[PDB]
């Protein structure tokens, strides 16, 4: 299985435009991740990972993005905050695992890494597994803003500015979210 294509990738996606890769037509052995980074968190929800070698799943989705360390707790079923509500939402029925590790050596830059952004304003919360890459102005006031930012109308995206001088809470963390799906279609990912 193309686990390396997701984990050892050069650049990860911003959390607001998060990446999804469908895993199929392969055997899912995780020895790779076991021989991967010293992990910050390996949080599985609704599934024993000690049973992830006898899996027999049809489709497995590898969601990947970058956030700060403070926000890794938000990547969980039934959480709240800017990331969980505006950028990446997991369902309360989530059947998968969240793998995260400090990426400060790859994603932090000298004057801040302003290529990683996240969504700060949204009128309603995302539905689970929804993706909003819109860049349109936000209306915090009652002035109708005809595509123009300003006094009470905001641009909805904000860069992280990852710097090596930040503490681990604000340092970049790469997150891979494996969603284990069970449909009637025969097994395409096994162990």
């Amino acid at each position: 299985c193309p686990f390396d294509e997701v984990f050892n990738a050069t650049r990860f996606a911003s959390v607001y435009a998060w990446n999804r890769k469908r895993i199929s037509n392969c055997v899912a052995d995780y020895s790779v991740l076991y021989n991967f980074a010293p992990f910050f968190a390996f949080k599985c929800y609704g599934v024993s990972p000690t049973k992830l070698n006898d899996l027999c799943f049809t489709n497995v989705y590898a969601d990947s993005f970058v956030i700060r360390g403070n926000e890794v707790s938000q990547i969980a079923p039934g959480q709240t905050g800017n990331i969980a509500d505006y950028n990446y939402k997991l369902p309360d029925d989530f059947t998968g695992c969240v793998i995260a590790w400090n990426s400060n050596k790859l994603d932090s830059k000298v004057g801040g890494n302003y290529n990683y952004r996240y969504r700060l304003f949204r009128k309603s919360n995302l539905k689970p597994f929804e993706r909003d890459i819109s860049t349109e102005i936000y209306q915090a006031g009652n002035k109708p803003c005809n595509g123009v930012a300003g006094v009470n109308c905001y641009f909805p995206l904000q860069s992280y500015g990852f710097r090596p001088t930040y503490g681990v809470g604000h340092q970049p963390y790469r997150v891979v979210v494996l969603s284990f799906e069970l449909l009637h279609a025969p097994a395409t990912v096994c162990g």
Partner: single-chain antibody, 229 residues
Framework: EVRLLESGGGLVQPGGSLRLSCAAS????????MSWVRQAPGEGLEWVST????????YYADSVKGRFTISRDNSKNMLYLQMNSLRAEDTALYYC?????????????WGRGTLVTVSQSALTQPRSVSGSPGQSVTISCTGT?????????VSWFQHHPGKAPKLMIY???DRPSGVPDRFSGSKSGNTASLTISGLQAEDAADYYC?????????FGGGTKLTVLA
């Protein structure tokens, strides 16, 4: 493959002006910070200036602040240094460097250097250490709480005046590609330490510690390592 090439050095009168250029090749130039490091004849390595990957962040050394201007053209894969009010103490071989293989704040890739002729507060190292072939030597580097004791972004460089320095240790303890396990590093508080074991004749060189502190990069005074045949 990956290459940096300096150019634009020459003879200029004191108080004159010169512009240096650095040509990148083999990597995504606009993803990485670029830095200028110089070596003045008889002097140790000195960090001159660092530009961020975008260009909206410039950092300078107090010894040059106000007189040089660093810039980059990401469309042309070029880094530039505008040196004005050139003094005699600016006579040096100038190098451009980035951290393409380690991290954005290190110097692992270097150019060959360009020669500029115009007509301390460094980290404290021993000036000289000697050792016999096959033995081991330890070289110490003592800085303040704002550099070596602030972060763990310490580096160790091998250097021969007249050629670019080579990164030997980064992140206190790690070796880049091609560096033998005979070189190893450690840190305790404000002091870092490089140990060279199994000394060979070619290990004789100058050794500099280095520290990145956010707003600046600072080199040690350098330790000449003589390997007595």
């Amino acid at each position: 493959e990956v290459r940096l090439l300096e150019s634009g050095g020459g003879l200029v009168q004191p108080g004159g002006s010169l512009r240096l250029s650095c040509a990148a090749s083999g990597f995504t130039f606009n993803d990485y910070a670029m830095s200028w490091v110089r070596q003045a004849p008889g002097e140790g390595l000195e960090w001159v200036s660092t530009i961020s990957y975008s260009g909206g962040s410039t950092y300078y050394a107090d010894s040059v602040k106000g007189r040089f201007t660093i810039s980059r053209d990401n469309s042309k894969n070029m880094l530039y240094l505008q040196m004005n009010s050139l003094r005699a103490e600016d006579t040096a071989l100038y190098y451009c460097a980035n951290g393409v293989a380690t991290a954005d704040w290190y110097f692992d890739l270097w150019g060959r250097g360009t020669l500029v002729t115009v007509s301390q507060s460094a980290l404290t190292q021993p000036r000289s250490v000697s050792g016999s072939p096959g033995q081991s030597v330890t070289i110490s580097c003592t800085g303040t709480s704002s550099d070596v004791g602030g972060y763990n972004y310490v580096s160790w460089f091998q250097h021969h005046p007249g050629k670019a320095p080579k990164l030997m240790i980064y992140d206190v303890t790690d070796r880049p590609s091609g560096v033998p396990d005979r070189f190893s590093g450690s840190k305790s508080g404000n002091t870092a330490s490089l140990t060279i074991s199994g000394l060979q004749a070619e290990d004789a060189a100058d050794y500099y510690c280095c520290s990145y502190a956010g707003t600046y990069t600072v080199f040690g005074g350098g330790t000449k390592l003589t390997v007595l045949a």
